[PDB]
Amino acid sequence: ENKVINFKKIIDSRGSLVAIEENKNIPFSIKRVYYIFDTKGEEPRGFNANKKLEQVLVCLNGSCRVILDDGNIIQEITLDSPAVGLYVGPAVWHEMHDFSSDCVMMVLASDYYDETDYIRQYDNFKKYIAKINLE
Amino acid sequence: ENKVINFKKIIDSRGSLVAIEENKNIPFSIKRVYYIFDTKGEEPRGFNANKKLEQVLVCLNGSCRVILDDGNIIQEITLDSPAVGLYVGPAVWHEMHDFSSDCVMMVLASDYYDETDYIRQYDNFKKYIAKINL
Ligand SMILES: Cc1cn([C@H]2C[C@H](O)[C@@H](COP(=O)(O)OP(=O)(O)O)O2)c(=O)[nH]c1=O
Ligand SMILES: Cc1cn([C@H]2C[C@H](O)[C@@H](COP(=O)(O)OP(=O)(O)O)O2)c(=O)[nH]c1=O
């Protein structure tokens, strides 16, 4: 609704195609594009949040289960269609679970990588939130 | 000229990661990302060149065989690895073939989709270049 993104997909005799255009079908400017592949193992990914960064998650192949928490509510959504993007805003905790063996997960980011934008501790994250409420 | 870009790739028990950053590891600013999937049939694609667009192609899954003509040299390249990107500069002809079934192909473009920037006559492409040569 506010988080789930339905990208317009095109289909022909040849296949499918999806195009994402910076600040057209995504609320921000693209500066970085990262992706995860050749996954394996039972240990998740993510479990962190970001102060400034805005992102959009997309399961290009296979599937992945992702959790969300803006401190308030928690949401879960299983990405399994390249045509769907998930919006992860700043100040939103995230987790990437259950990567299918063939999963390819892509992320469109508003800025370059920067370890100091991270909130990797749940409590601080929570903390971070409350503080915020006050202001 | 080689047009291949090899991205640094992180590795751990979890899998692999590759990160592409506008103007950092790719000679241009990203304005659009598009990908092709659920491909079928025996028809290739591409077959055009762009006068202003700068792209980078990445085969995120499976594989695909690419042909790039810069007007000086033709290069055929099989992409079967997400950590390799091919740079398709302006006035560079390209074609995608041999898409595996599970093939997922991705393109990073320096600009929005503009049909008018597209040359779809190889011959014309060849001419445009010559002209360019002056
Ligand atoms: C997402 C991302 C990660 N990285 C680096 C940070 C780490 O050195 C590594 C893995 O990222 P991440 O999964 O966040 O690391 P960690 O194992 O601590 O959870 O990749 C970049 O360099 N650029 C990026 O865009
Ligand atoms: C690559 C791309 C395609 N499309 C559309 C154009 C077409 O209607 C469809 C796929 O077409 P395309 O791959 O460009 O080739 P062709 O015109 O020969 O069919 O997707 C966009 O809207 N934006 C893009 O960035």
PDB file of all heavy atoms in Angstrom, chain B residues 2-13:
ATOM      1  N   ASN B   2      38.245  -3.112 -24.555  1.00  0.00           N
ATOM      2  CA  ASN B   2      37.566  -4.090 -23.750  1.00  0.00           C
ATOM      3  C   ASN B   2      36.420  -3.297 -23.185  1.00  0.00           C
ATOM      4  O   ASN B   2      36.577  -2.102 -22.954  1.00  0.00           O
ATOM      5  CB  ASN B   2      38.466  -4.533 -22.596  1.00  0.00           C
ATOM      6  CG  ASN B   2      37.760  -5.509 -21.701  1.00  0.00           C
ATOM      7  OD1 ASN B   2      37.054  -6.406 -22.193  1.00  0.00           O
ATOM      8  ND2 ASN B   2      37.946  -5.328 -20.394  1.00  0.00           N
ATOM      9  N   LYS B   3      35.271  -3.892 -22.965  1.00  0.00           N
ATOM     10  CA  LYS B   3      34.168  -3.088 -22.437  1.00  0.00           C
ATOM     11  C   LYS B   3      33.605  -3.633 -21.139  1.00  0.00           C
ATOM     12  O   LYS B   3      32.686  -3.105 -20.526  1.00  0.00           O
ATOM     13  CB  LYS B   3      33.073  -2.980 -23.479  1.00  0.00           C
ATOM     14  CG  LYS B   3      33.428  -2.037 -24.622  1.00  0.00           C
ATOM     15  CD  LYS B   3      32.752  -2.475 -25.913  1.00  0.00           C
ATOM     16  CE  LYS B   3      33.280  -1.796 -27.171  1.00  0.00           C
ATOM     17  NZ  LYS B   3      34.743  -1.612 -27.190  1.00  0.00           N
ATOM     18  N   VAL B   4      34.215  -4.730 -20.766  1.00  0.00           N
ATOM     19  CA  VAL B   4      33.950  -5.516 -19.605  1.00  0.00           C
ATOM     20  C   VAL B   4      34.381  -4.829 -18.331  1.00  0.00           C
ATOM     21  O   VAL B   4      35.470  -4.259 -18.234  1.00  0.00           O
ATOM     22  CB  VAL B   4      34.734  -6.834 -19.697  1.00  0.00           C
ATOM     23  CG1 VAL B   4      34.733  -7.513 -18.338  1.00  0.00           C
ATOM     24  CG2 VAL B   4      34.159  -7.775 -20.738  1.00  0.00           C
ATOM     25  N   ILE B   5      33.500  -4.901 -17.355  1.00  0.00           N
ATOM     26  CA  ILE B   5      33.762  -4.353 -16.070  1.00  0.00           C
ATOM     27  C   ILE B   5      33.639  -5.519 -15.133  1.00  0.00           C
ATOM     28  O   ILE B   5      32.681  -6.278 -15.247  1.00  0.00           O
ATOM     29  CB  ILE B   5      32.687  -3.426 -15.600  1.00  0.00           C
ATOM     30  CG1 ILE B   5      32.483  -2.237 -16.511  1.00  0.00           C
ATOM     31  CG2 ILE B   5      33.010  -2.984 -14.179  1.00  0.00           C
ATOM     32  CD1 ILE B   5      31.287  -1.416 -16.024  1.00  0.00           C
ATOM     33  N   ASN B   6      34.586  -5.667 -14.228  1.00  0.00           N
ATOM     34  CA  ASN B   6      34.520  -6.748 -13.275  1.00  0.00           C
ATOM     35  C   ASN B   6      34.352  -6.123 -11.910  1.00  0.00           C
ATOM     36  O   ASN B   6      35.284  -5.461 -11.452  1.00  0.00           O
ATOM     37  CB  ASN B   6      35.794  -7.590 -13.248  1.00  0.00           C
ATOM     38  CG  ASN B   6      36.097  -8.314 -14.529  1.00  0.00           C
ATOM     39  OD1 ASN B   6      35.540  -9.389 -14.787  1.00  0.00           O
ATOM     40  ND2 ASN B   6      37.051  -7.775 -15.283  1.00  0.00           N
ATOM     41  N   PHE B   7      33.173  -6.313 -11.284  1.00  0.00           N
ATOM     42  CA  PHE B   7      32.904  -5.742  -9.977  1.00  0.00           C
ATOM     43  C   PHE B   7      33.445  -6.555  -8.831  1.00  0.00           C
ATOM     44  O   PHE B   7      33.442  -7.795  -8.871  1.00  0.00           O
ATOM     45  CB  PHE B   7      31.397  -5.612  -9.740  1.00  0.00           C
ATOM     46  CG  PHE B   7      30.770  -4.843 -10.861  1.00  0.00           C
ATOM     47  CD1 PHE B   7      29.967  -5.471 -11.815  1.00  0.00           C
ATOM     48  CD2 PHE B   7      31.011  -3.473 -10.947  1.00  0.00           C
ATOM     49  CE1 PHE B   7      29.398  -4.739 -12.853  1.00  0.00           C
ATOM     50  CE2 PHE B   7      30.450  -2.728 -11.978  1.00  0.00           C
ATOM     51  CZ  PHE B   7      29.651  -3.369 -12.923  1.00  0.00           C
ATOM     52  N   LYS B   8      33.885  -5.834  -7.797  1.00  0.00           N
ATOM     53  CA  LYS B   8      34.412  -6.471  -6.601  1.00  0.00           C
ATOM     54  C   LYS B   8      33.279  -7.252  -5.994  1.00  0.00           C
ATOM     55  O   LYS B   8      32.169  -6.721  -5.927  1.00  0.00           O
ATOM     56  CB  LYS B   8      34.866  -5.416  -5.622  1.00  0.00           C
ATOM     57  CG  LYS B   8      35.534  -5.964  -4.377  1.00  0.00           C
ATOM     58  CD  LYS B   8      36.290  -4.860  -3.642  1.00  0.00           C
ATOM     59  CE  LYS B   8      36.406  -5.065  -2.138  1.00  0.00           C
ATOM     60  NZ  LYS B   8      37.509  -4.283  -1.551  1.00  0.00           N
ATOM     61  N   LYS B   9      33.515  -8.492  -5.565  1.00  0.00           N
ATOM     62  CA  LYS B   9      32.385  -9.219  -4.997  1.00  0.00           C
ATOM     63  C   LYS B   9      32.612  -9.790  -3.610  1.00  0.00           C
ATOM     64  O   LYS B   9      33.530 -10.567  -3.379  1.00  0.00           O
ATOM     65  CB  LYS B   9      31.852 -10.272  -5.961  1.00  0.00           C
ATOM     66  CG  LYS B   9      32.058 -11.693  -5.477  1.00  0.00           C
ATOM     67  CD  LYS B   9      31.192 -12.714  -6.176  1.00  0.00           C
ATOM     68  CE  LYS B   9      32.001 -13.835  -6.812  1.00  0.00           C
ATOM     69  NZ  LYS B   9      31.279 -14.526  -7.894  1.00  0.00           N
ATOM     70  N   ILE B  10      31.762  -9.417  -2.667  1.00  0.00           N
ATOM     71  CA  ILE B  10      31.896  -9.915  -1.299  1.00  0.00           C
ATOM     72  C   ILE B  10      31.423 -11.356  -1.122  1.00  0.00           C
ATOM     73  O   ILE B  10      30.465 -11.808  -1.757  1.00  0.00           O
ATOM     74  CB  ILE B  10      31.273  -8.956  -0.284  1.00  0.00           C
ATOM     75  CG1 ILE B  10      31.700  -7.551  -0.655  1.00  0.00           C
ATOM     76  CG2 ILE B  10      31.732  -9.261   1.142  1.00  0.00           C
ATOM     77  CD1 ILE B  10      33.136  -7.263  -0.266  1.00  0.00           C
ATOM     78  N   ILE B  11      32.094 -12.093  -0.234  1.00  0.00           N
ATOM     79  CA  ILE B  11      31.695 -13.466  -0.027  1.00  0.00           C
ATOM     80  C   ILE B  11      31.790 -13.955   1.379  1.00  0.00           C
ATOM     81  O   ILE B  11      32.772 -13.720   2.079  1.00  0.00           O
ATOM     82  CB  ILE B  11      32.420 -14.444  -0.915  1.00  0.00           C
ATOM     83  CG1 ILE B  11      32.362 -13.951  -2.358  1.00  0.00           C
ATOM     84  CG2 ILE B  11      31.730 -15.798  -0.772  1.00  0.00           C
ATOM     85  CD1 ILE B  11      33.401 -14.601  -3.274  1.00  0.00           C
ATOM     86  N   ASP B  12      30.752 -14.671   1.767  1.00  0.00           N
ATOM     87  CA  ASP B  12      30.687 -15.226   3.088  1.00  0.00           C
ATOM     88  C   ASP B  12      29.764 -16.404   3.049  1.00  0.00           C
ATOM     89  O   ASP B  12      29.267 -16.770   1.995  1.00  0.00           O
ATOM     90  CB  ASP B  12      30.257 -14.198   4.149  1.00  0.00           C
ATOM     91  CG  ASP B  12      28.920 -13.601   3.842  1.00  0.00           C
ATOM     92  OD1 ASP B  12      28.045 -14.185   3.215  1.00  0.00           O
ATOM     93  OD2 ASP B  12      28.815 -12.379   4.299  1.00  0.00           O
ATOM     94  N   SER B  13      29.547 -16.979   4.209  1.00  0.00           N
ATOM     95  CA  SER B  13      28.713 -18.132   4.353  1.00  0.00           C
ATOM     96  C   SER B  13      27.311 -17.908   3.813  1.00  0.00           C
ATOM     97  O   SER B  13      26.579 -18.835   3.488  1.00  0.00           O
ATOM     98  CB  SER B  13      28.680 -18.502   5.827  1.00  0.00           C
ATOM     99  OG  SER B  13      27.744 -17.690   6.538  1.00  0.00           O
TER     100      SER B  13
END
